[PDB]
């Protein structure tokens, strides 16, 4: 879980300050549409020399082990990252790339930044990738990590991350037809199919206010419109 | 009494059908189809999923060979590069500059986030399939009923015998090979396990990949080791698995060509919408009076009091009757662009009942049927 | 005059997890062309309790109106950045690219620092917007902003920036015909109508050696190569 102290690892680029850091990524796990990273590092988050906390951490430094408050020493990408759970030898924590991760000291030991290339793994949905989470409605499938403080890695596990949305879709039934007046802010996906008394086998991309007709039998239509799953309609409005 | 009628494979919208038989007393029919699963058996053939790559320390033998051989786990590949660092130079200084030989070896393993960010090639074998039939029978509106579509048994539920003649989709719409992403479910074709496929799916296979155990094909192509350093260089093809994300259709749940709702990894298409499902509705004699009320009705007139064009129930409409004795009739519209809201109408002597009804004609025009007579309606709008 | 007192404000990434900051950016203007910063703090520059300085600001951080140095609480990019007037609430700044302004105190072990990725707007002033200041080329008209205040926002203003010029449409003279050979090194709208009894109304985006061809009367046609508004020729062998 949290087992051993931790340990120095080669950091691919770092000053002259230091190489032979701490804080110095094994690995990162994504597939996460939030903007959350699960870090390997070298040294152990979420256990101080006191054993078990959830918001120290340890490192050794390739100079010295000692621990310290998630303050001086700060992830970044460009801007500080502040963590979110702590497993040991793994940090789980909201700093979206996880594709470089830089962790430095602006604080401690002159100026320190290890910067670390290393593993992601990353995935559409199947509709639009996303790893922002805004408070705009509906969320689509993704990837996040447990917050295991205790049984060493954060299970993956599935999750709900909130998707971009744009101005919503002026739906305008009518008589066996129903156009979708679409108006996106970012690229949708739109796959149709009637329902009903027919279904419609119907991929395009929209972006920008457009219309699209389909047909509908006076028994509606599915449609999902990308960073959103199915909106249908079963009306006898069309 | 058995009243077949022909129900749209539509979800929300119930169907009016007449349970008729006038001089007794016609039975309110309201068919919905709430829900439609056709449910295959799914023979899981391998799981393929995004691979990262796994490069053991090569073992390097200064001053005699290093062997090694293919191996099937995953896409192992090992390359015997000789003479690979002099004396002086090279990223171990071997006093044999002919005899020290570095074995590169790597292979490919699942990613951790397989499991759940994994991709299932799935061949299908046959299927029952399970159709959710209201059949309303009597003046209520819902009942609710379990019914194989596929020939099992016939419905012996106490709501109605319901015998669903094939459903618009009484099989899914899947190949006999199907990806399912657990995300996102395509049909989608991909060779038998045994063999894998580099820049294509199926880059791992295995019948539950664990991170060995596989029969990978990914490329993996050892390149001999850059000199004046330790390193185990390799090239590859694309990660097929990835490049089929990259090379793959519209979701087939959003763009299913039978309306369905199709769903992942036990594999199954959900709530169905193309086509009309013929439904044979148990209706019992017990549901109707015995010719003890005679539904005779006569002198009927539809005055449509408004509507509106093309609603999901926007028609109001009015049937004014005389009626020999009283009774509850079915009103109903056997279309499935139409059905009228109401279900029931209220016989009287000189009775008049506002009924509901949608259409989705530009005028709505419904023909309903009472008990005994039958009107097709057009009005004030 | 200024006189809307400085206050603290959250600001989303500072320390690791620190946010509770003073001299946070709030809102920016990047109306200029040039690489100076119109800012917004919560922090009130160019007053302290003495009133108006030239080279003090204000802030709370449990205070009201305490002051330091334009030096103590420094602007950086990556390094340094001087200030350069102070309007109140607002602060105008140099500071090397004004696309990234960090406003932060490097005191201590709790550092707090503000970052605001601040941004250079180029709109229409010629026919054409245009880019950042060079080398090449010579100052223009472009939007900007005042960088002195009036003893609390900037006001608007049309200063002078760089603008990348290039060569100009190279006219070679025909029969009453110009070929305009025009030679852009960065992105120029041509802009053109004859000036003659004809007209030319081509608007197009041209950049690197090319050809427009126009049409003359024998009586002159403008061409506008943006950043610039329009240039005339008259009758030649226009």
Same mark, same amino acid.
């Given at each position: 879980?949290?087992?051993?102290?931790?340990?120095?690892?080669?950091?691919?680029?770092?000053?002259?300050?230091?190489?032979?850091?701490?804080?110095?990524?094994?690995?990162?796990?994504?597939?996460?549409?939030?903007?959350?990273?699960?870090?390997?590092?070298?040294?152990?988050?979420?256990?101080?020399?006191?054993?078990?906390?959830?918001?120290?951490?340890?490192?050794?430094?390739?100079?010295?082990?000692?621990?310290?408050?998630?303050?001086?020493?700060?992830?970044?990408?460009?801007?500080?990252?502040?963590?979110?759970?702590?497993?040991?030898?793994?940090?789980?924590?909201?700093?979206?790339?996880?594709?470089?991760?830089?962790?430095?000291?602006?604080?401690?030991?002159?100026?320190?930044?290890?910067?670390?290339?290393?593993?992601?793994?990353?995935?559409?949905?199947?509709?639009?990738?996303?790893?922002?989470?805004?408070?705009?409605?509906?969320?689509?499938?993704?990837?996040?990590?447990?917050?295991?403080?205790?049984?060493?890695?954060?299970?993956?596990?599935?999750?709900?991350?909130?998707?971009?949305?744009?101005?919503?879709?002026?739906?305008?039934?009518?008589?066996?037809?129903?156009?979708?007046?679409?108006?996106?802010?970012?690229?949708?996906?739109?796959?149709?199919?009637?329902?009903?008394?027919?279904?419609?086998?119907?991929?395009?991309?929209?972006?920008?206010?457009?219309?699209?007709?389909?047909?509908?039998?006076?028994?509606?239509?599915?449609?999902?419109?990308?960073?959103?799953?199915?909106?249908?309609?079963?009306?006898?409005?069309? | 009494?058995?009243?077949?009628?022909?129900?749209?494979?539509?979800?929300?919208?119930?169907?009016?059908?007449?349970?008729?038989?006038?001089?007794?007393?016609?039975?309110?029919?309201?068919?919905?189809?709430?829900?439609?699963?056709?449910?295959?058996?799914?023979?899981?053939?391998?799981?393929?999923?995004?691979?990262?790559?796994?490069?053991?320390?090569?073992?390097?033998?200064?001053?005699?060979?290093?062997?090694?051989?293919?191996?099937?786990?995953?896409?192992?590949?090992?390359?015997?590069?000789?003479?690979?660092?002099?004396?002086?130079?090279?990223?171990?200084?071997?006093?044999?500059?002919?005899?020290?030989?570095?074995?590169?070896?790597?292979?490919?393993?699942?990613?951790?986030?397989?499991?759940?960010?994994?991709?299932?090639?799935?061949?299908?074998?046959?299927?029952?399939?399970?159709?959710? =039939?209201?059949?309303?029978?009597? &003046?209520?509106?819902?009942?609710? *009923?379990?019914?194989?579509?596929?020939? +099992? /048994? %016939?419905?012996?539920?106490?709501?109605?015998?319901?015998?669903?003649?094939?459903?618009?989709?009484?099989?899914?719409?899947?190949?006999?090979?199907?990806?399912?992403?657990?995300?996102?479910?395509?049909?989608?074709?991909?060779?038998?396990?045994?063999?894998?496929?580099?820049?294509?799916?199926?880059?791992?296979?295995?019948?539950?990949?664990?991170?060995?155990?596989?029969?990978?094909?990914?490329?993996?192509?050892?390149?001999?080791?850059?000199?004046?350093?330790?390193?185990?260089?390799?090239?590859?093809?694309?990660?097929?698995?990835?490049?089929?994300?990259?090379?793959?259709?519209?979701?087939?749940?959003?763009?299913?060509?039978?309306?369905?709702?199709?769903?992942?990894?036990?594999?199954?298409?959900?709530?169905?919408? =193309?086509?009309?499902?013929?439904? &044979?509705?148990?209706?019992?004699? *017990?549901?109707?009076?015995?010719?003890? +009320? /005679? %539904?005779?009705?006569?002198?009927?007139?539809?005055?449509?009091?408004?509507?509106?064009?093309?609603?999901?129930?926007?028609?109001?409409?009015?049937?004014?009757?005389?009626?020999?004795?009283?009774?509850?009739?079915?009103?109903?519209?056997?279309?499935?662009?139409?059905?009228?809201?109401?279900?029931?109408?209220?016989?009287?002597?000189?009775?008049?009942?506002?009924?509901?009804?949608?259409?989705?004609?530009?005028?709505?025009?419904?023909?309903?049927?009472?008990?005994?007579?039958?009107?097709?309606?057009?009005?004030?709008?």
């Amino acid at each position: 879980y949290k087992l051993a102290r931790p340990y120095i690892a080669d950091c691919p680029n770092c000053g002259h300050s230091r190489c032979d850091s701490p804080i110095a990524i094994e690995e990162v796990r994504g597939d996460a549409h939030a903007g959350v990273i699960r870090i390997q590092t070298s040294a152990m988050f979420g256990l101080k020399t006191d054993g078990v906390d959830l918001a120290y951490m340890s490192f050794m430094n390739g100079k010295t082990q000692k621990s310290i408050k998630i303050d001086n020493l700060h992830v970044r990408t460009s801007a500080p990252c502040s963590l979110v759970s702590h497993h040991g030898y793994y940090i789980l924590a909201q700093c979206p790339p996880g594709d470089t991760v830089t962790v430095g000291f602006h604080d401690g030991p002159n100026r320190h930044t290890c910067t670390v290339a290393h593993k992601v793994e990353f995935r559409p949905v199947g509709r639009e990738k996303y790893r922002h989470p805004p408070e705009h409605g509906v969320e689509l499938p993704c990837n996040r990590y447990t917050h295991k403080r205790a049984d060493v890695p954060f299970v993956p596990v599935k999750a709900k991350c909130i998707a971009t949305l744009a101005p919503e879709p002026l739906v305008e039934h009518k008589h066996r037809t129903l156009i979708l007046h679409l108006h996106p802010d970012h690229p949708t996906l739109l796959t149709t199919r009637s329902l009903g008394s027919d279904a419609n086998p119907t991929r395009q991309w929209i972006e920008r206010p457009t219309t699209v007709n389909f047909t509908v039998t006076g028994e509606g239509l599915e449609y999902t419109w990308g960073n959103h799953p199915p909106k249908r309609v079963w009306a006898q409005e069309s | 009494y058995e009243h077949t009628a022909v129900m749209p494979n539509k979800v929300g919208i119930p169907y009016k059908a007449l349970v008729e038989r006038p001089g007794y007393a016609p039975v309110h029919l309201q068919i919905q189809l709430v829900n439609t699963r056709i449910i295959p058996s799914t023979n899981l053939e391998y799981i393929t999923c995004k691979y990262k790559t796994k490069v053991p320390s090569p073992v390097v033998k200064c001053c005699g060979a290093t062997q090694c051989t293919s191996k099937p786990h995953p896409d192992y590949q090992c390359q015997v590069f000789t003479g690979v660092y002099p004396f002086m130079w090279g990223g171990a200084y071997c006093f044999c500059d002919t005899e020290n030989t570095q074995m590169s070896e790597a292979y490919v393993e699942r990613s951790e986030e397989c499991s759940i960010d994994h991709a299932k090639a799935y061949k299908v074998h046959t299927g029952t399939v399970q159709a959710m =039939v209201n059949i309303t029978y009597g &003046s209520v509106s819902w009942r609710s *009923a379990d019914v194989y579509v596929n020939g +099992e /048994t %016939p419905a012996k539920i106490g709501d109605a015998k319901l015998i669903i003649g094939p459903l618009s989709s009484a099989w899914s719409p899947f190949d006999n090979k199907v990806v399912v992403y657990g995300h996102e479910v395509y049909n989608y074709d991909f060779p038998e396990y045994g063999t894998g496929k580099a820049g294509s799916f199926g880059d791992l296979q295995s019948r539950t990949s664990t991170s060995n155990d596989l029969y990978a094909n990914t490329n993996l192509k050892l390149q001999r080791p850059q000199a004046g350093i330790v390193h185990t260089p390799f090239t590859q093809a694309p990660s097929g698995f990835e490049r089929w994300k990259r090379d793959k259709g519209a979701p087939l749940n959003d763009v299913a060509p039978f309306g369905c709702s199709i769903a992942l990894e036990p594999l199954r298409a959900e709530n169905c919408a =193309v086509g009309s499902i013929p439904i &044979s509705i148990d209706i019992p004699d *017990a549901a109707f009076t015995r010719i003890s +009320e /005679t %539904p005779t009705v006569s002198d009927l007139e539809c005055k449509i009091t408004e509507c509106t064009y093309a609603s999901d129930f926007g028609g109001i409409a009015t049937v004014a009757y005389k009626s020999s004795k009283a009774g509850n009739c079915p009103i109903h519209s056997p279309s499935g662009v139409a059905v009228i809201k109401e279900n029931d109408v209220t016989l009287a002597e000189s009775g008049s009942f506002t009924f509901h009804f949608s259409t989705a004609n530009i005028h709505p025009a419904f023909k309903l049927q009472v008990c005994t007579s039958a009107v097709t309606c057009k009005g004030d709008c």
